[PDB]
Every structure is written in C-alpha cells, then in structure tokens.
Symmetry: D2
C-alpha cells in the first residue's frame, strides 16, 4: 500500500455511507494509520466503533465552531503521534431551509454565516491548527467540495457559495504551506448515496453513464494524501465520472 | 445613450477614485438616472455632492450589515421610482490585519465572518431586497470581484475566499432571477489606485498597463444595458488580459 | 452610437441569419463603417447586396486557405481605409461527416486538418495580415467560438478541438498585440437559428429560459469592438443566456 | 502494485529524461506490463534497451503522421496481447522556428498544421486505433498537456493552440468512450528539463520547485489504474501549484 507509514486525521465520518468513511477505508487499505473527529457527543460511540474496525483508537471531539476544540484535537493527537501526514476535511453544514427552493427566498444572513463558517472557514482553521504537526513532513490536506462551487445548481443554494469559498481556501492554503512541505488539494465529488432524480440525471448524462462511489472518491483521496501526488497542490480534482466536462446532453 | 431612462442604484461610491464613481459616470453618460447608497453618516454630504454632479438627489444610508437598512433603502427609493432597472454592488471589506502576510497567520474566525458577510452575502441580500422593484423589467445587477476569487495571490488572503463566494453568488443569483427578467453579472477588475502590485500587473499583462475606472465603468454600463441581454451569470475580466497571461519572466 | 469613426472588416456574412450579419447590423447601428469578405464567387452578389443595405461597397474575396488572398484583402482595403479599427472572425468549417455521431468513428486526419486550418489558424492568419493596418489605432479583433471548445458535447466532435485551438489563439493573439494597442477577444455564442431539440434543451435549462439571438451576439461584438471595452483583452465572453454556468438541471 | 497485470502501451519514450520514461518506470513499479513505440528507426536500439530494463521486449515503430503505422502497431501488439489496459500519449512537435519570439511573426500555416496534426490529432488517432483492444476492459488513456493550452505564455506560441486542441480531444474522447469502459484523462505538467523558465516557476509556484518525471509518472500510473475509475475527461495539473498562483512579484 502506498500510504505505508502515513498518519492521517479524518473529519466528517458519521456513518459507513459517508464520503469520509470511503476515504478512511481506502487509506487503511493502503497502510495508513487513522484518527477521527466527531462533532457531537451523541455520535461518539458510533464513531469509536467505526474507528476500531479501521484499527484506530484515536477519536476526538471537534466542533469546528470552536477554536479551543480545534486546537485541543492537535494537542491531544500530538501525545500519540510525532507528526501528522494527512488531514481530511469532509465537513459542511447549512440550515436545511436554506438548501432547497428559490435561492434568494431560502437564503438568510444567519444561514449564510453558519454555512461559510462551518463549511469553508473550517478548512483554514484546521490547517492552521495542524500546521506545527504537519510542517516539514511532506504531508497533505484533502478537502471535499461539490460542483455548486463553480456552477449554479438547483437546491444547493448558499452551500454553493460556501463551497466556492472553500475551493479558494484550498488554493490559498496550498500557496501558504507549500514551502513548508504541506500540500492542499480538493475533490469535487459527484452525487452519491429530487435526490433520486439528481442521481438519475447524472448517470444518464456523464461520460461514464453512472454515478461515482465512495470508494472512487476514497481512492482519489488516498492518492492525494500519498507521496505519489507530491507534484500536485492547489488542485480540485473532479471525481464525478466526467459529469462537469459534458454539456448539451439531450 | 444606451441606458436612456434606465434607473440604477449604485453602492460603494465613496470618492471620485472609487470604482463605483467610474460606473456612475459611465452610466450617466449613457443616459441613466442614478441613485446612491452611503454606508456611514460621516460620508453623507460627500456622497450627496457627488450625486448632484451626476444629476441625482437620490441618496440613502445603507450599511449592508443591516437587513433593516437594506430593505429600507428600497422602501424609500420606491417612493420616487416605480421600479429599478439596475443595481450595482461595489462593496467589500475585511479587517486590515487579515489582508497582508501569511494567509493562515493573518486569518481569524472573526475576520473570515466579517469579510464574507460584507463582501459576499451583501450581493444576494441586495438582490433579494431589490427583487420586487426589479422583476419583470429586463433589469440587471452588476457586482465587482477580483482575481483572488479564482487564484491564490499574496496579501488578498481571506478576501479571496470572500470573492469566490461572491462569484458563486453571482451565478446562483443569475440562475434564480433569469426567469423573472433580471440578469446578474460580475466584473473581475484589475487593480486600480500596492504600488508594486500595480507595477507588476502593468509589466505583465497583454496591454502593458493598468485598467481605469472608466474602463470598468463602461463595461458595467454595457452589462446594465439591454445590449448585454444575452449575458447572465458571467464574470468579465477587465484587467487588460492579466488573468490569461502566464510564465512571464 | 459608440462605434462612430470605426472601420470594421467582417468575415463570414453569408446570409441575414448568420451571426456575422447580426454583428454587421449591430455595428452599423452604432455608427461603424463596414467591409466584408466572401469565400466563394457564387456568394459574391448576395454579399454585395447585404453590404449595400449596410451602406458598404467594400467587399473582397478571401479564401482563408490562401495566404495570398488573405494578404490581398488588406492591400485592397488599405487603398480605401487609412487603417482598420475592427476585425470580426466569424468563419469555421469542417466536413459534414465529421460533425455527427460517434467522435472517433467520425474523425479523420483530413477532416481534423481542414477543421483546424479553416476554423482556428484563420484567426492568427487574419490578425497577422491585418497587423500593419490595425497597430497603433486602439483597434480590436473579435472571434466567434462555441461551448464545444471547453466541454464535450454531442455532434460537434472535431470542431470542438478546432474551437479550443481558436480560443487559445485568441489568448495568444491578445498577448501578442496588446502592446501595439490591438485587442483580441472571443464570444462563445449559444445555439441560434437534433438541432430543434438542442435549442429546446438550452431554452429549458439556461438561466434566461430562452435561446440567444444574433442581435444579442451582435451587440456584444459591437461592445468588444468599441473603446468602451478598452480594458478587456484575451477574454471569451459567453452570450448563451447563462447556459454554460448552470448544471444539474433536471 | 495497483497496476498489477495491467498491459500498457507508452508513446514518446526517447530517453531516461523523457516524461514517458518517468511514466513507464512508475507503471512498472506498480506491476504493469509495458510496450513502447518509437518514431524513427534511428531510435529503435535505444528504445529497445530502455524497454528491456523495464522488463519489456514489446517495441514498435509508430510515426503518428501515418495512419498505416498507427493501425499496424495495434495489429502487431494484438499478436502478443489479448487486449490493452492502458495507453499513454506523450508526444508533441512543432517546428523550432514557430516556438520562440513574437507569436504572429513566428507562426505559419505549415507550422500550425504540423503542430496540430502531431500534437493533437494523434490523441484521437491513437484512441481510435486502440479502441477494439481497449473496449470492455475498464481501461484508460492518459495524455500530456501544458499550460499554454489555457494561458498565453511566451515562446510556446502555436503549441499552445495545439495543446488546447489536445485538451478538448481528451474531453471528447472521454465522452466518446466512457460507455465502453475506457477513460481518457490529461496531465498538464509543469516544465521539466529554458533555464530561466524553470527558475521562474520554482520561484513562483506554491511548492517553490519544479516537478519531476517521477511525480508526473506516479500521477499517470494513478490515472491508468482502477483507483481513478471515477475520473474521466479531467486535466490534472502536476506543476507544484503553479497555475493556481498569481500576482507574485
């Protein structure tokens, strides 16, 4: 496996359906050692269980709304690990009411603020807090994005703005940390397990004529966290079966 | 002129150096009737003076931090105008400390929040509040962005994230309002009066010079006019070709 | 009109349906003085008639396959005009058999060569030949492109490759001539008068919920040929009613 | 390795400095079985030697100017291999005179034609000829591009137009073959050993250094493997972040 010796912290793993689980599993299959965060105490047990199946006992509470908690994760993790080789940002949130229907009717100041703070600011906040552990290690950050960053799409609404902010954050973080040997890249993932019809629309219209899997996203993340991708930084890689590059599909 | 009789509300005109002034002047030259906002009471007199030179007595306070104030503008403006044909978003802010040096060292939660709220959320907030006045008129919104949206650049830092959010907001607003006959477009302007930034751009862009507020202004006038009726959700680069050049030693 | 005093050469005007006619008409309405090319002698009369309705007697044969003919246009035009303020490239060709069905089955070396030579090389060839007349005049070139340059689309096939070549040509030409006061920009136009269903697909899916007109393309060209756009060069402007920036339209 | 048993044809390997060599080596390290093309008979021996060090005796003449030769490669290769899992396009050419100085002064019809035919048409020509061998295998094509496709750069000139054509060819090929289980992707590589170009990039990119053929090679190996099965029509930048940086004085 090409992540032998790599130590990787993974956010956003709330179930076996989650993108972060696909990433965790892919990384574990390539020999990485893993650690995880959970946002709320209700999920702790479930996350510890998933971690254990992935050979990890390293699980930490981290509400990315809190600078203290973010920093505490790395202080606690640093007791176990000499350094951090990988960091996976797979977290986003916006109030449900802002994520459907008319873009302007559904948006509000509060939903905007929340969406950007949790979904976009969290990337540089985590990179900043991880920086002492990651610098000088030829390490890597991967963050998950979505086509709403760069295209107007139905129902994504304010999250589109937040993902665009995130994607810029990826570029700025990469430009910031490259000299210290830390890479930062994104994956714009296609939709995964109107939602049934979204999936159908994509599978009918993309070059691969199917939806992508968490394994496909996971393996791309594993590559971007590995030294195999050492020439790549500030990149958004589309794992959508070619969807974004197709047009005029009647 | 090609904006003859068009009624246009312009934000961000704080001086004759401002991008918004260049836009105002360009629109006035094409026959538009103008109205303006000012952020703080200290600027009222100065903005009323500029408005008057552009043949306008329509000036309103609007701190885009305030939903009350945003909506009040359109209530007050609607007493004078039956409808609104144009809306110009030319406002942005981030704490000065967040806009130089190392990106991660200079960033903070508060500066991030402020930068996005004032610089990005303000576009959909203004479009939303203007919607009753603008819909059904084949009207137009124009917002100002910057290269930091789509490239990592030194010293722009968190504003880059905020402009990227804005540019997505332009796309989503355009997709939202197109059916009601409202367009929404952006201009990514090159730098305009840091001395070395300007010099770097003038040495490296195809035109070998910096762009002017007149050039940004005329592009805005075009994007506010019916001449651009086939264009929406677009970011147009008025940077003398800077963004499309590379590997210039 | 904002093209007062401007002298503009327009290629590709073969009928009143053509994009170039929309451009000619738009430019004439803003006060430009026009000249035109025609590729084959069969069209001469028809083009002279259209020119005359647009107040022009300046019509020249120009097969862009021929360097001699390209150069001759500017030698002949230079007898009438002190300089050239505008140049509109609205020409493209590929063999019909290469423009439908499966991309690889339909492509051939010969069709590729022809498509690129006529549709892409013609831009720098025309800019080069026009350069003595255009330099120092604060003049402008506009070329027409299509979404196939930057997205995979059905049926456009090799023309997509040719348009991508063209769009790069626009950038390189702009970078080349900017110092001499010549701008070069593109318009990526949406479809205009499976073709009936293409038009329907676009009108159902773009932000404006309709197809664009030759007037809308024409007015954008007029702007890009005018001094109002003096800050803009190397740009591709999408006149497609927002189509290219939308996605996941179910 | 993650290409274990994969059978991959590689073009453009003319020396150990070549991008294609970096790709070959990276693929061999992941367990791929390799075959190679050479453009001219003068290079045959040198290419056979390199192939042998990479455990291959499968080497074929292929001047991509020739449809006969392109198709012959696959007829000859098909005698040894039941099918083809990977195809690497790492070839490009334009007359030297067209690749420096003023873009319009340096360009010509002939140089344009040659550059596009050899550098761009060769991708769909090779994909087409390989299609019977590749279809139904969950196989992959990778092609090499350069920033000149999407930015105006000094000295690349007409090759920029040719690479843009290539990148569109990658998209169209991907859209064409995806249903048959063949992917097609590109790598836009940073410069690799002009001395000042390399210096400019190393001073300006996020990584503050030039990329290596190993880095390009490993990315190609990934894009040729099933690990990348969700990715097609993509251009991946292996340039140490160069293309995403701007305004660096």
């Amino acid at each position: 496996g090409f992540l032998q010796g790599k130590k990787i912290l993974i956010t956003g793993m709330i179930s076996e359906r989650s993108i972060a689980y696909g990433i965790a599993k892919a990384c574990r299959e390539q020999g990485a050692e893993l650690a995880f965060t959970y946002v709320v105490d209700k999920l702790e047990e479930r996350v510890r269980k998933m971690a254990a199946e992935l050979d990890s006992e390293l699980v930490f509470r981290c509400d990315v709304a809190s600078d203290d908690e973010i920093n505490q994760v790395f202080a606690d993790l640093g007791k176990h690990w000499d350094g951090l080789d990988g960091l996976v940002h797979s977290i986003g949130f916006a109030p449900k009411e802002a994520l459907s229907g008319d873009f302007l009717d559904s948006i509000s100041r509060e939903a905007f603020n929340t969406a950007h703070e949790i979904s976009a600011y969290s990337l540089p906040a985590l990179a900043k807090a991880a920086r002492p552990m990651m610098r000088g290690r030829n390490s890597a950050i991967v963050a998950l994005s979505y086509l709403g960053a760069v295209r107007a799409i139905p129902n994504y609404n304010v999250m589109g703005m937040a993902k665009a902010s995130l994607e810029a954050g990826i570029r700025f973080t990469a430009a910031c940390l490259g000299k210290e040997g830390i890479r930062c890249n994104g994956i714009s993932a296609g939709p995964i397990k109107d939602f049934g019809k979204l999936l159908g629309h994509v599978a009918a219209h993309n070059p691969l004529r199917r939806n992508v899997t968490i394994e496909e996203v996971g393996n791309t993340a594993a590559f971007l966290l590995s030294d195999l991708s050492s020439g790549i930084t500030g990149e958004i890689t589309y794992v959508d079966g070619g969807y974004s590059i197709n047009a005029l599909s009647t």
